[PDB]
Design a protein around this ligand. Structure first.
Ligand SMILES: CC(=O)N[C@@H]1[C@@H](O)[C@H](O)[C@@H](CO)O[C@H]1O
Ligand SMILES: CC(=O)N[C@@H]1[C@@H](O)[C@H](O)[C@@H](CO)O[C@H]1O
Lengths: 423, 423
């Protein structure tokens, strides 16, 4: 069982729909998604609408989110909910009790962390009453608020982020759903970044990744290149290598076909090739495409390509990429899991299990180049850490037979941690 | 006719009521206010709820502001509406298209000023449909964002603020209502500040002031002192000193009895003394107390005294200060205007009419001290600029007979531009 779903962008209003929900349109949105053969949706409430003061939660807003989940279920979809937005498509929505005169750190100020826990437990309790509610992700790429190049960064060490995760994630746990968090790919490509690969592959229930080829992959290897279409698979192999549990699932929680680096006509093939190659990771649990519906052209200041990331267009009509993704779901949702891999790329790690050189793993880095060279060569390479490579019974338990080390490392030549040159 | 009203703080939910309005309790709120003898309310929508995207306005939010205006009208109240909140009681509510990765200047970016005009036009066209709609203020203390000590300031020259006010106020105009803006007292007391005394007494329909004795007046002069009780009179006399039109109305649009500097059982006396001296200003058009209802105790991070600024308690019960203000309205709403004033303090002004030394105007500066000495000695001083003072024709026209200049000037020894030490 391989899951196929979409990140749900309301067709009428986007995430501004929460201010005045058109429930007939939301219902129609999810009926279309379900008829495409999807089995789940990811849902994005707005934090400052849920919690506009630190000690006052908007109860109509919480019931709004529950209703969206319920309508989803009515159409046979599972629903996954992100809480701390927070960051969406280059916009930050932040509570006024955390900015300007009330500027604070959502990761390190105990007051904030206490209000965050209260909102998550409120969300979790009320949503668990819905059967369609299948998981809680703490927020969307919450790590982007924690380091450069964020212009109003809320700094923290990796040990403080450790405690932040340990404080929030139990509050989201519960019978019948997953507890998760999500990060952008700075977690693996940026040295000194306080969100770390070990956290991503040990805390919460699955290893969660977002695959975006506008981060240098497409510009550096080539939009139509095989490296470019192999990249979601590389991110999945990379992210799972840093867990103690070799079988921990990976959620390809975001993948899209960004038209600032791909040409429009190529996005259906990019979709088919990217998803086909991604399923060659036996740890892959699900694929969630970004996104269900185009962003209304009447809303400005988005980087232009965000308006056309939908599987459905501005009129709500199914696009070629949507037909492709729906055909993928019908072809692979019952496929057997990929065969194990016997060739491995070895990444050196500190005592804690985190990469000694994170810059080498990004687009155009020595590790990424090495994995791609083997992948294009047909070797089906997997990825392990130096702690595993040193242990012969650990190697034999995984069936590894051929090791490739990064002998002459260099930093990622292609990487850029920002979605549009304007930031 | 002297107008008596309140800044309306919804008893249930404060301005988070917009996210989930209890319309019955809002009707009860405005019924109380009407029964107390008030003839108008001032109301505060939230900017990022009205305009979450630069080119996308939330029609339901606009409709709810209309519904609020309409409900005030049902109880014989006139309704004045601020648009750009913006700033409310130490919190900033800012659109996500002006912050972090979309950090902009709301005074100088043509795109932002165009979106601002479109919101004003929309609000004006729609609220104009209610007869109870009598005036539009661009926003509450919009100057606070333009200069130190704001941690994320959108800076500007006074010329650009001329341009900003001029680009916005025509759009707010219309038969049957006023067009205004509002500032905090830094406009008169901070040197270099780009919102100026000349703007305040020339642009829009009346000179708008907010009178808060926690700015140093109470601490420096004494909470119970003749000085402190006379401060709102000082601010009305001072603000109109800088206009071309000696008859231009002054609206005392905010005055509260802050319990961080006043004793609780003193606030009714302070209210009586403040209003009785305020109406000694011929130009005074109305007195709008801050505020109607207590800030719910369950909401945190307010400066503590802000919680008890209501005329009614949280449970909706009239407080002693409220009883007092209601009788002040009965007492004065029909009184003959104040007698003219023959004794004047002269302020030296530059070529355009703004004060050469603004720091001398604040609590405990030389000009404030000089005006207070004459006010306390029973000499009822008014205030003029050096340009009027050097013109025997202008002086005769005002009927001024005796002039008092600032011989040895000095900066305001008491002034603090924030409402809580924590800022
Ligand atoms: C300000 C900015 O660039 N934000 C983008 C965000 O929109 C996107 O979701 C993410 C991809 O994982 O990359 C970030 O850099
Ligand atoms: C940061 C801060 O304290 N801002 C306050 C504001 O809340 C208040 O409305 C105003 C009164 O004039 O005084 C400002 O200094």
């Amino acid at each position: 069982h391989m899951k196929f779903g979409v990140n749900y962008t309301p067709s009428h209003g986007w995430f501004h729909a929460w201010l005045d929900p058109d429930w007939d349109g939301i219902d129609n949105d999810l009926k279309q998604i379900s008829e495409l053969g999807m089995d789940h949706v990811r849902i994005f409430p707005i934090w400052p609408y849920l919690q506009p003061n630190r000690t006052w939660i908007n109860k109509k807003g919480v019931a709004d989110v529950r209703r969206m989940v319920h309508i989803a279920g009515e159409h046979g979809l599972d629903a996954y909910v992100d809480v701390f937005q927070g960051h969406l498509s280059s916009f930050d929505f932040l509570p006024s009790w955390l900015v300007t005169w009330h500027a604070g750190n959502m990761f390190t100020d105990a007051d904030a962390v206490a209000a965050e826990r209260e909102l998550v437990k409120t969300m979790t309790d009320e949503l668990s009453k819905e059967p369609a509610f299948k998981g809680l992700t703490l927020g969307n790429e919450v790590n982007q608020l924690s380091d450069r190049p964020h212009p109003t960064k809320m700094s923290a060490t990796d040990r403080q982020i450790d405690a932040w995760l340990d404080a929030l994630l139990p509050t989201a746990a519960g019978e019948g759903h997953n507890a998760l968090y999500s990060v952008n790919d700075g977690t693996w490509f940026i040295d000194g970044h306080p969100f770390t690969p070990v956290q991503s592959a040990t805390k919460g229930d699955m290893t969660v990744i977002h695959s975006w080829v506008f981060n240098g992959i497409a510009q550096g290897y080539g939009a139509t290149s095989e490296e470019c279409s192999s990249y979601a698979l590389y991110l999945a192999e990379l992210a799972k290598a840093f867990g103690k549990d070799s079988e921990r699932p990976v959620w390809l929680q975001e993948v899209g076909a960004p038209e600032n680096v791909l040409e429009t006509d190529y996005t259906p093939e990019f979709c088919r090739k990217t998803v086909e190659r991604a399923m060659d990771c036996r740890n892959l649990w699900g694929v969630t495409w970004w996104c269900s519906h185009d962003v209304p052209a009447s809303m400005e200041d988005f980087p232009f390509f965000e308006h056309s990331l939908g599987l459905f267009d501005e009129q709500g009509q199914l696009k070629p990429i949507g037909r492709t993704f729906g055909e993928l779901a019908a072809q692979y949702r019952s496929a057997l899991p990929a065969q194990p891999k016997t060739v491995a790329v070895v990444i050196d790690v500190d005592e804690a299990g985190n990469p000694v050189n994170r810059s080498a793993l990004g687009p155009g880095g020595s590790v990424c180049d090495l994995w791609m060279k083997l992948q294009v060569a047909g070797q089906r390479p997997t990825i392990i850490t130096s702690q595993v490579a040193a242990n012969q019974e650990a190697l034999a338990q995984r069936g590894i037979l051929e090791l490739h080390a990064d002998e002459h490392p260099y930093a990622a030549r292609y990487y850029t941690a920002v979605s549009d040159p304007s930031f």
